[PDB]
Structures are given as structure tokens and as C-alpha cells.
């Protein structure tokens, strides 16, 4: 029988885009392809407002847009927990929290784009103990992205290369490089982003005067 | 005052995708940017079933999917005329027909991706007299595409370079290279194409057993 | 053991670029990775000057630039035969010629980008019987390109599908979409194309005043 | 008339690739096209071996490969100073050093890809005062890269926005997303990387057994 899996994507989602969404679909299809898993749920967890130097739209707006984006999904949902904490939280702690909730046992895996794996290499960015826990205790499903070589990142990381059974590389056969930064700039300039992000998200953005 | 413009996109739309749709949005924003035009309507005209060697889904299905895709557009519509003719028709004749309908005067311009301009160079593909009429009588709005150099195609074409006032190059700042061929293959394999094409189009495809 | 293979690339090479050369390397590694082939040579065959609607630099120059580009390759050479003929020649005929030239005999395969595979679909472009002879009697090695889906092209063409075993899809996880059209325009504007095409080619272009506005 | 400019590129260059070199050419043409600058030199400065978490080839080798790659450039040279220091050094300090070296004086600007511009946003990575001195006292020339939106990065950073006149966005209408990570993995697998990095670099790599699995 197949192992039940829940995919957790942590990120800014400022705003959520069709690209972030496609990431779940490709990841799910990949895991199902292996024959060993049965993805049962997808979770979008927007980062807290105290994170980073960049000024994101308020967390309640990012959760609301993600929710609207997912109204048309029958397996992916947004979870505000992380954004509703008083402070930013390292991702491994978000995995721990969501794992606990699952026990109130499916496997919880972190879902991310290849650019994320590359940040594992950034000085003082991620704790090595955390990278190890993520791939050893939970699991990692990485979706390809132009200009990134996931296989190489894994091979060159002493930590990742020792936990490949728990790392799944899902290749993106389509060229999808739509930047959220670009989306925000286009909106600020009054230009269309239709067909780049869900219509409901576009409406919400207009209604609430976001990115202007 | 601004010159009223109607954009006509001729193609297979087998099926229509978010990329084909984004093409209209970018083209419209570009023309509006110049300050000289006011795009009043967009028209998707699916090619007839006798065209080419490739086996397309029946024209009534392609029109139906385009219609569903456009239900959420307030300015773009599908026009079945071309696909409802007994035989394939050169594009200039589709422009002539739609121009006549406009008179029962806005400017009618052909909308296409950069790869189209490149086919103008294919031996025995397009009649030179037709390429001239399209750019001289109507106009051409070209949206960028990875691997294509529209400025060079124009400069190297004796015909195009003499009619640049009627050619508008709209640059696509986003990397959007989602192939319809890939979409069809993914669907045939039972894989998701959600977030690549509109949900309503996906539903229609399933309902009518298309691309299987 | 491994069967010998010669790769033939027909195209404009106006001018030959690093991308065109990369195609040969990717294809060879791919064929070797299958374990059944041993690529022994690559051939660059610039198209005749009567070809198409686009003005190409003289074949004399395109052959020269390819030769100079290939001076640093130990397995790929340029062959001017096709360009020296009185007129343009269908690709199947160039394959036939080079096959005879080879005549326990190595297999000659057409090397091309995925885009060319898409052109097989173009009405009145390639004769169906030629596409058939190309994939059946020779073989095709196709290198991936952004925006193209070679697997789908093959599945949607009855001819390609039937002879798919003779079609080798090589994929390069790299994005190398550098068009020769852009190369020519940049050169005409006095901009650099260094590191996009070989230094020897840029030298020849400058020395012979090619691609000037 | 035009003010003289020296371009400084700090990075790993593990190994230097055609893409890294292309960056210099695109940036120079861009600056010249503005009409107010005259690029007189480019400098490749490989990072110190104590840098980061990733294992890099020895700086001795990275400097050597850059020198060999640049033998065919008449304006870009490699400078080992940064890599010869006892430890990693913040980029603003390397700029300060090379500026003093120049000391009616040319302007020294940091040359980088758009991705580096995005790293300015990374928490605890770049000191805000350094980002400020880099864009105000030196200048930044950024080359576009797929998936990045330099214009938005600048608009969203108060510091960058305030000194945007000293940030030059160069765009190359070409897709050249060839990662050095892929280059290293391919080399470790015995695959070709010819036409992705300079022939002289491949020779050095083979001769010194670099990037072996
Ligand atoms: N075109 C595309 N194709 C495929 N994937 C794409 C994509 N665009 C975005 N993505 C993916 O979308 C996801 C979210 O993107 P985005 O909204 O930009 O989110 P982003 O800012 O990239 O997310 C940063 C996340 O990492 C966490 N973090 C950072 C640093 C250290 C630690 C720690 O625990 O020590 C944790 C942080 O708390 C936050 O959850 C990413 O996984 C990205 O790769
Ligand atoms: N990712 C993307 N980014 C930007 N644009 C994109 C795109 N994907 C498709 N497109 C554009 O979508 C449009 C439709 O695409 P697709 O569905 O593939 O349609 P396609 O098969 O490329 O369309 C062929 C059209 O050209 C006409 N034609 C061909 C040859 C000769 C003559 C003549 O009159 O002599 C006429 C033909 O009747 C038909 O209307 C194209 O303009 C394409 O460039
Ligand atoms: N970035 C890139 N990545 C991978 N491959 C890339 C590439 N850029 C070009 N290429 C490849 O380079 C090669 C040469 O490119 P280019 O210089 O543009 O050559 P191109 O003009 O595309 O070559 C046309 C060729 O097809 C032949 N043809 C056409 C139509 C009908 C028939 C017939 O026999 O009926 C024959 C014609 O005789 C000529 O040899 C192509 O195979 C192209 O796919
Ligand atoms: N395809 C492509 N198109 C355009 N540009 C491309 C490229 N591939 C790489 N590049 C560019 O090549 C250059 C070198 O690449 P790579 O070899 O990967 O170098 P990389 O590891 O990205 O360089 C990091 C550099 O940033 C410095 N840094 C980092 C963090 C904090 C601080 C500080 O002072 O606080 C300084 C560090 O000392 C080092 O010099 C980069 O500018 C990159 O953007």
C-alpha cells in the first residue's frame, strides 16, 4: 500500500501566483509516479510579517489571497498558523508544528523550488542541524527551476547527499519563470497580470489596494 | 484622440492556454503604453480542421474551450467564422473578413507570437503579397518569445522593414514557454495541467474525452 | 560491441554559434550513454545559397567560419559538398550522399534541434516520404530546446511514432537559447557577441566585413 | 567627454564560464550605449577559500582558470589579491582596495548578475551600510537573468531606490542560464562542457584533475 503524504510549502506568497500553484501539481504527480506515495493534502503556509528586509503585504492579506487562489483546488489549503505567530519561525519549527497536528501517520514533506536548495548553501542562512532534520525527519520535494541544478546541489552538500531517499526531484518540463517581484511591479504600474495569477487574487488585490 | 484597435489572433488553440491568453493582455498594455491606441476588442479565431498535417481536436471543441477560457475576459471573444468555413483559409482572408464586419473605423491588427514572424521566412509557407498586405493594410503586434529575435526578423525582411510603423513589438518580461504539445501529452498521460490552462477548459477536456 | 555513428548537421550556420556546436557535444554524450553507440565523427553541412527567402552570408564564408570554429574540435568537421552544388538540395539527398561517402559500415544520423522536428509538421515543407526515409534508413538525434516538446512531436506523427527507436532525444539541462538572428543584429550594431560564438569566427567576421548593417 | 570606468566582478568562478565572461561584454556595451562612460578595464576577483559552506576548487586553480580564460580578452584580467588574503573579505572592502589601487580618476563599479541584487534582501547576509556604500560610492552594473526582476528589486529597496542613478541595468535579449553547478556535475560524470566554458579552462581542469567525483 502507498504511504500517505502531506506537502507543506513555506514562503512569502506575496502574492501567490500560478507558478507557486503549479509547483504543487507537479510535485504531486511526481510522487504518485514513483508508485510509493499517495499525496493526500497540500498546505500553503505564508511567512510571518517580521521576516526579512522586504516589505510584504500584511499576512492576513497573503492568507486571504492564497485562500481565494485555492478555492478551486480540491486538495491544497492555506494554513495561517505560521503567519499568526508573534514572530518569524524557522521552517523546521513549522514542519514540527504541522507534523504534531497530523498526529492530533502520513509523511510530512517540505515542498519547494530548486532555488530553495541553493539557499541551503548561503552563509548563516539555514542552520545545518535544521537542514539535516528537514531531510532526515521529514523529507523534501524539489521542483525544477531554470538556472538551477538540484542534482548538483544535493551531491555537493554533505548533509543532503546522505539523505537522498528522502529527497525527491520533480522535473518541470515547462518554462515557468514568472517572478512575484515582477507581478508586484506590473500591478504598481497599472499593467495586467491576468493569466499569471488567479482572477480572484487579482480582484482581491484591486479591492484592497494592494501593491500600489 | 486614440485610434480604436481590434486584435485578431489566428491559430490552432489546441487547446487554448494561459500563454495564448497572456499574449492579448501584454499586447493590449503595449499598445496603450504608446498612447496612440485604444484596444477595444480581442478576437480568437481557431483554424479550420483541414489545416496542416497535425490532428487537432474538432473545431467545435476548440471554439468551445476558447469560449470557456474567455468567459472571464471582459474584452476578448472567440469567433468561429474561420473554423466554420468548408476549407482552410489564408490568414489575410480572415483579416479581410473581420475587417469587413467592422464596417458592417477601428484598426484591425494581427496578433501573434514572435515565432510567427519567423515562419514568414519559411519557403512556400506564406505568400509575400500576403505578408505585405498584413503589415501594410492591417498591422501586426508581436509578443516576444524565448529564442526569437523579432527586431532581427523585421530588419532582415525586405517587406517588414518597410512597414515598421505598422509593426508593434511588445516585449514579454516573464519567461512563459508552455507548449500546447506538452499540455496534450501531459493530459494523455493523466497528468495535471492545472494552472497552465483555465480550469473550465480542463473540465471541458475531461467531460468530452479530448486528448486521450 | 558499439556500432559506429557519424552525426550530420544540416543548417544555415549564419554564422555557426556556440549553441550549434554544443548540440554536437550533447548528442554524442547522449548516444554514448545509451551504451550501444560510438560517435566517430560529426559533420557540419552549411546550406546552399539558393535556399529560403532570407539573405544568408555567402556559403564560401559560412563554410570558412565553420572550419575556423572547428579547428579546436578533434571530431567535428565542416563539409562544403552540399553548399557547392548548383542548387539547394533536400536533406534526405545530403544524407544519401554522405552515406555513400562512408561506403561493417557506420550509421549516419541527422543531428538537429527539437525545433526542426516541429518543422516536419509544416504544410508543404518536408515530403512525407523523405521524413520516413530520414528516420528509418538514417536516424535522428534531436537536442532539446526551450518551448518544444520532442516526445509529443513523435507521439503525434504516425511516421515518427512508427520509427521512434531510430529517434534519439538528447536533453541538455541547460538554457542555451541564443539565436543567430540576434547574433547578426548585434554584430550589425557594433555590439559584442564574444562568448556566444567562437573567437575565430568573430575574427573572420571582422576581417571580411560580414553582417554589416 | 566620457568618464573612465573599471568593472569589478567578485564571485566564486568555480569554474569561470562563458556566461560569467559574457556578463562583462554585455555590461560594457550597455555603459557605452549610455554615452557617458568608457569602460577601460574589467577585473575578475575570485573569492577566498574560507568563503561559504560549499567546497570550492582551490583559489590557486580558480585564479589560474580565469587567467587562461582571459588570455583571449584584451580588456579583462584576473586579480588574485582578494583570494590571497588570510580570510574572506566583504565585497565593499575589495572595492575599496581596488579603488585605492587606481589612485581625474576612473569610477570603479561592481559588476554582477541580477541574482546578486536579489541577495541584498537576504537576512543577515549583506550589511545595509555596505549595500549603501557599494551603490553610492562605487556603483553597480547588473546583468539580467531569467526569473529575476532588477527594476522591482531597486524599487522595493529604499537604499537602492535612493541611489538608482548609480545602478545600471544591462539587459541581454539572450537566454544564457548555464549554471556552474551543472558544469561541475557534468565534468564529474565525464560529460562534455565544451562550448559552455572556454577551451583553455577545460584543458586546465583535465590537466589538474579538477571537479572529479
Ligand atoms: N517559478 C517557480 N517555479 C517553481 N517554484 C517556484 C517558482 N516561483 C517560486 N517558487 C517556489 O515558491 C516557494 C515560495 O516562494 P516565495 O514566495 O518567493 O517565498 P520565499 O521568500 O522564497 O520563501 C522563504 C521561505 O524560507 C524560509 N526560510 C528562509 C531562510 C532560513 C530559514 C530557516 O528555517 O532557517 C527558513 C522562510 O521562513 C520562508 O518560509 C519557494 O519554495 C520557491 O522555490
Ligand atoms: N508561450 C507563448 N508566448 C507567446 N505567444 C505564444 C505562445 N504560445 C503560443 N503563442 C502564440 O499563439 C498563437 C497561436 O498559436 P498556435 O495555437 O500554436 O497556432 P499555430 O499553429 O502556431 O497557428 C498557425 C496559424 O497561422 C496561419 N497560417 C500559417 C501558415 C501560412 C498562412 C497564410 O495565410 O499563408 C497562415 C494558420 O492558418 C493559423 O491561423 C501564435 O501567434 C503563437 O505565436
Ligand atoms: N539554441 C539551440 N539549441 C539547440 N539546437 C539549436 C539551437 N540553435 C540552433 N539549433 C539547431 O541548429 C541547427 C542548424 O540551425 P540553423 O543554422 O538555424 O539552420 P536552419 O535554417 O534552421 O536549417 C534548415 C535546414 O533544414 C533543411 N530543410 C528545411 C526544410 C525542408 C527540407 C527538406 O529536405 O525537405 C530541408 C535545409 O536544407 C537546411 O539544411 C538546427 O538543427 C537547429 O535546430
Ligand atoms: N547565467 C548568468 N548570467 C548572468 N550573470 C551570471 C550568470 N551566472 C552567474 N552570473 C554572475 O556571475 C557572478 C559570479 O558568479 P558566482 O561564481 O556564482 O559567484 P557567487 O558565489 O554567486 O559570488 C558571491 C560573491 O558575493 C560576495 N558576497 C556574498 C554575500 C555577502 C557579501 C558581503 O560583502 O557582505 C559578499 C562574495 O564575497 C562573493 O564575491 C555573479 O555576479 C553572478 O550573478
PDB file of C-alpha atoms in Angstrom, chain C residues 18-19 21-22 24-26 28-29 33 69-70 72-76 146 171-179 182-183 185-186 189-196 198-199, chain D residues 18-19 21-22 24-26 28-29 33 69-70 72-76 146 171-179 182-183 185-186 189-196 198-199:
ATOM      1  CA  UNK C  18      28.438  28.087 -29.595  1.00  0.00           C
ATOM      2  CA  UNK C  19      24.879  26.704 -29.384  1.00  0.00           C
ATOM      3  CA  UNK C  21      28.499  23.334 -31.540  1.00  0.00           C
ATOM      4  CA  UNK C  22      27.099  22.449 -28.127  1.00  0.00           C
ATOM      5  CA  UNK C  24      27.126  18.047 -31.223  1.00  0.00           C
ATOM      6  CA  UNK C  25      28.637  17.518 -27.773  1.00  0.00           C
ATOM      7  CA  UNK C  26      25.294  16.890 -26.071  1.00  0.00           C
ATOM      8  CA  UNK C  28      27.474  12.488 -28.607  1.00  0.00           C
ATOM      9  CA  UNK C  29      27.379  12.101 -24.808  1.00  0.00           C
ATOM     10  CA  UNK C  33      25.229   6.970 -22.521  1.00  0.00           C
ATOM     11  CA  UNK C  69      35.201  27.280 -35.355  1.00  0.00           C
ATOM     12  CA  UNK C  70      36.067  23.576 -35.655  1.00  0.00           C
ATOM     13  CA  UNK C  72      39.607  23.329 -31.891  1.00  0.00           C
ATOM     14  CA  UNK C  73      37.396  20.214 -32.230  1.00  0.00           C
ATOM     15  CA  UNK C  74      39.015  16.818 -32.679  1.00  0.00           C
ATOM     16  CA  UNK C  75      35.925  15.083 -34.119  1.00  0.00           C
ATOM     17  CA  UNK C  76      33.695  17.582 -35.939  1.00  0.00           C
ATOM     18  CA  UNK C 146      13.007  25.690 -24.841  1.00  0.00           C
ATOM     19  CA  UNK C 171      18.316  16.608 -23.285  1.00  0.00           C
ATOM     20  CA  UNK C 172      20.664  19.301 -22.003  1.00  0.00           C
ATOM     21  CA  UNK C 173      19.562  20.578 -18.553  1.00  0.00           C
ATOM     22  CA  UNK C 174      20.942  23.973 -19.648  1.00  0.00           C
ATOM     23  CA  UNK C 175      19.173  27.014 -21.156  1.00  0.00           C
ATOM     24  CA  UNK C 176      21.117  27.997 -24.242  1.00  0.00           C
ATOM     25  CA  UNK C 177      18.611  29.863 -26.366  1.00  0.00           C
ATOM     26  CA  UNK C 178      20.945  32.208 -28.195  1.00  0.00           C
ATOM     27  CA  UNK C 179      19.633  32.941 -31.680  1.00  0.00           C
ATOM     28  CA  UNK C 182      20.213  38.145 -32.541  1.00  0.00           C
ATOM     29  CA  UNK C 183      23.968  37.456 -33.196  1.00  0.00           C
ATOM     30  CA  UNK C 185      21.736  42.089 -35.389  1.00  0.00           C
ATOM     31  CA  UNK C 186      24.182  42.666 -32.513  1.00  0.00           C
ATOM     32  CA  UNK C 189      25.062  47.308 -34.314  1.00  0.00           C
ATOM     33  CA  UNK C 190      28.728  47.030 -33.354  1.00  0.00           C
ATOM     34  CA  UNK C 191      27.915  45.141 -30.136  1.00  0.00           C
ATOM     35  CA  UNK C 192      29.935  42.224 -28.794  1.00  0.00           C
ATOM     36  CA  UNK C 193      28.970  38.609 -29.364  1.00  0.00           C
ATOM     37  CA  UNK C 194      32.121  37.352 -27.689  1.00  0.00           C
ATOM     38  CA  UNK C 195      31.478  34.199 -25.657  1.00  0.00           C
ATOM     39  CA  UNK C 196      28.307  33.492 -27.728  1.00  0.00           C
ATOM     40  CA  UNK C 198      33.859  31.228 -31.192  1.00  0.00           C
ATOM     41  CA  UNK C 199      36.631  33.804 -31.144  1.00  0.00           C
TER      42      UNK C 199
ATOM     43  CA  UNK D  18      31.216  31.600 -20.857  1.00  0.00           C
ATOM     44  CA  UNK D  19      28.215  33.126 -19.041  1.00  0.00           C
ATOM     45  CA  UNK D  21      32.550  36.324 -19.344  1.00  0.00           C
ATOM     46  CA  UNK D  22      29.505  37.305 -21.382  1.00  0.00           C
ATOM     47  CA  UNK D  24      31.447  41.664 -18.895  1.00  0.00           C
ATOM     48  CA  UNK D  25      30.768  42.176 -22.603  1.00  0.00           C
ATOM     49  CA  UNK D  26      27.075  42.955 -22.129  1.00  0.00           C
ATOM     50  CA  UNK D  28      30.477  47.237 -21.319  1.00  0.00           C
ATOM     51  CA  UNK D  29      28.271  47.673 -24.406  1.00  0.00           C
ATOM     52  CA  UNK D  33      25.409  52.913 -25.144  1.00  0.00           C
ATOM     53  CA  UNK D  69      40.074  32.071 -19.927  1.00  0.00           C
ATOM     54  CA  UNK D  70      41.104  35.734 -20.214  1.00  0.00           C
ATOM     55  CA  UNK D  72      41.910  35.887 -25.320  1.00  0.00           C
ATOM     56  CA  UNK D  73      40.400  39.082 -23.831  1.00  0.00           C
ATOM     57  CA  UNK D  74      42.121  42.406 -24.415  1.00  0.00           C
ATOM     58  CA  UNK D  75      40.454  44.244 -21.504  1.00  0.00           C
ATOM     59  CA  UNK D  76      39.544  41.813 -18.714  1.00  0.00           C
ATOM     60  CA  UNK D 146      15.902  34.661 -16.106  1.00  0.00           C
ATOM     61  CA  UNK D 171      19.760  43.545 -20.496  1.00  0.00           C
ATOM     62  CA  UNK D 172      20.866  40.778 -22.845  1.00  0.00           C
ATOM     63  CA  UNK D 173      17.961  39.587 -25.057  1.00  0.00           C
ATOM     64  CA  UNK D 174      19.583  36.127 -24.889  1.00  0.00           C
ATOM     65  CA  UNK D 175      18.855  33.140 -22.610  1.00  0.00           C
ATOM     66  CA  UNK D 176      22.161  32.044 -21.147  1.00  0.00           C
ATOM     67  CA  UNK D 177      21.219  30.253 -17.957  1.00  0.00           C
ATOM     68  CA  UNK D 178      24.083  27.796 -17.736  1.00  0.00           C
ATOM     69  CA  UNK D 179      24.939  27.072 -14.110  1.00  0.00           C
ATOM     70  CA  UNK D 182      25.698  21.839 -13.662  1.00  0.00           C
ATOM     71  CA  UNK D 183      29.192  22.372 -15.249  1.00  0.00           C
ATOM     72  CA  UNK D 185      28.406  17.804 -12.122  1.00  0.00           C
ATOM     73  CA  UNK D 186      28.777  17.167 -15.870  1.00  0.00           C
ATOM     74  CA  UNK D 189      30.338  12.472 -14.823  1.00  0.00           C
ATOM     75  CA  UNK D 190      32.829  12.617 -17.687  1.00  0.00           C
ATOM     76  CA  UNK D 191      30.418  14.576 -19.908  1.00  0.00           C
ATOM     77  CA  UNK D 192      31.441  17.427 -22.191  1.00  0.00           C
ATOM     78  CA  UNK D 193      31.110  21.070 -21.220  1.00  0.00           C
ATOM     79  CA  UNK D 194      32.813  22.222 -24.396  1.00  0.00           C
ATOM     80  CA  UNK D 195      31.261  25.423 -25.749  1.00  0.00           C
ATOM     81  CA  UNK D 196      29.841  26.228 -22.259  1.00  0.00           C
ATOM     82  CA  UNK D 198      36.464  28.230 -22.559  1.00  0.00           C
ATOM     83  CA  UNK D 199      38.622  25.547 -24.131  1.00  0.00           C
TER      84      UNK D 199
END
